[PDB]
């Protein structure tokens, strides 16, 4: 069938590829206009492909669809539209436009965790089963009724990295294959999503992603990994923005053999350098080890080096 793909990033791309590979026509993909000189993975791969590539800054303004945007999807003749990884809100007149609508993936096990970030709620919660689910789009936020979903397990140390391309990437590709496979064939279903266990949480940016320091180890340790790397838990330490990467909770040891000192503004206690990274303390006296450590300036550098 006609299909129009409206996403970014590599997983977009990959969704691209694997329905015009079962023999849709890939009508036009709608993405992210290039910044820093950079094209988006999905415009690069439909490009060569001579399918039509939409850079569209934004596709509502002032409450309403722009005119223009609307008209140049509608031309492309869409019978459904996928959105595998989409960053913008998309206007009814757009998702209502396809004879089949348009179906959207989203990696949580909705109703839990709508909006942008669910996985990094995911993590920050400590669920322990996540996933995602196909849903065909309606006005609400992720609201939309489901097609189908897929579930995994949650690991301790799982930051959003690490449950994103051993499950979330290649499990929701063939979830959106097959669910466009269910429509095409004319059996998806319309499931609606159960009221019970619905939950919203705001986007993960960098300015909401500052660390709560009077809490547990394990909270603090499901929220630096729920931010891991994207956008990046972070603290002040000596006056600079210092952010968190690769954190694992850790009872082990005394002391775990000594190590350095670290005083951190608000911190329970101060942490410790050591040969092995940062140890941290929560409220609770229990002890979270963080490998890595970036200041503002980019550089990434191992927590046991802080000082060196
Ligand atoms: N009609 C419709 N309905 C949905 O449920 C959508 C979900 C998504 C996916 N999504 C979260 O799962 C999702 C992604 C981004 C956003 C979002 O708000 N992005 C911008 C705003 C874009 C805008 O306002 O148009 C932002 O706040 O940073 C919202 C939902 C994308 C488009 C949708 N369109």
């Known amino acids: 069938m006609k299909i129009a793909v409206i996403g970014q990033s590599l997983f977009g791309q990959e969704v ?3 329905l015009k590979n079962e023999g849709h026509m890939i009508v036009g993909v ?3 206009p290039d910044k ?3 094209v988006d993975p999905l415009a690069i791969e439909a490009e060569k492909d001579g399918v039509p590539v939409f850079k569209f800054p934004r596709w509502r303004l002032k409450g309403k669809a722009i005119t223009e945007v609307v008209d140049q999807y509608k ?14 809100f998309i206007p009814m007149e757009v998702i209502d436009h396809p004879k089949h609508g348009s179906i959207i993936y989203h990696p949580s096990l ?13 993590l920050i919660h400590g669920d322990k089963k996540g996933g995602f ?9 992720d609201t939309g009724p489901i097609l189908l979903q897929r579930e995994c397990d949650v690991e301790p140390n799982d930051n959003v990295n690490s449950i994103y391309k051993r499950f979330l990437f290649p499990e929701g590709v063939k979830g959106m294959v097959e669910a466009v496979r269910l429509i095409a064939t004319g059996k998806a279903p319309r499931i609606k999503q159960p009221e019970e266990g619905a939950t919203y949480e705001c986007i993960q940016k960098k300015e909401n992603s500052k660390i709560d320091w009077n809490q547990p180890a394990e909270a603090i340790h499901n929220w630096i990994r729920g931010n891991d790397r994207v956008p990046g838990a972070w603290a002040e330490i000596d006056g600079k923005s210092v952010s968190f990467y690769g954190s694992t909770l850790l009872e082990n040891d005394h002391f775990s053999s000594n ?9 329970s206690r101060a942490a410790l350098v050591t040969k092995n990274g940062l140890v941290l303390f929560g409220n609770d006296g229990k002890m979270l080890l963080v490998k890595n450590l970036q200041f503002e300036d980019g550089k990434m550098i191992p927590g046991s080096q802080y000082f060196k």
């Open 16 to 18: 691209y590829k694997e």
């Open 36 to 38: 820093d000189g950079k």
């Open 30 to 32: 709608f993405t992210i």
């Open 259 to 267: 190590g350095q000192p670290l005083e951190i503004p608000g911190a």
């Open 110 to 122: 909705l109703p839990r965790h709508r909006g942008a970030s669910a996985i990094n709620w995911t």
């Open 133 to 141: 689910t196909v849903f065909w789009a309606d006005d609400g936020l």
């Open 75 to 88: 031309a492309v003749g869409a019978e459904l539209n996928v959105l595998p990884f989409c960053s913008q």
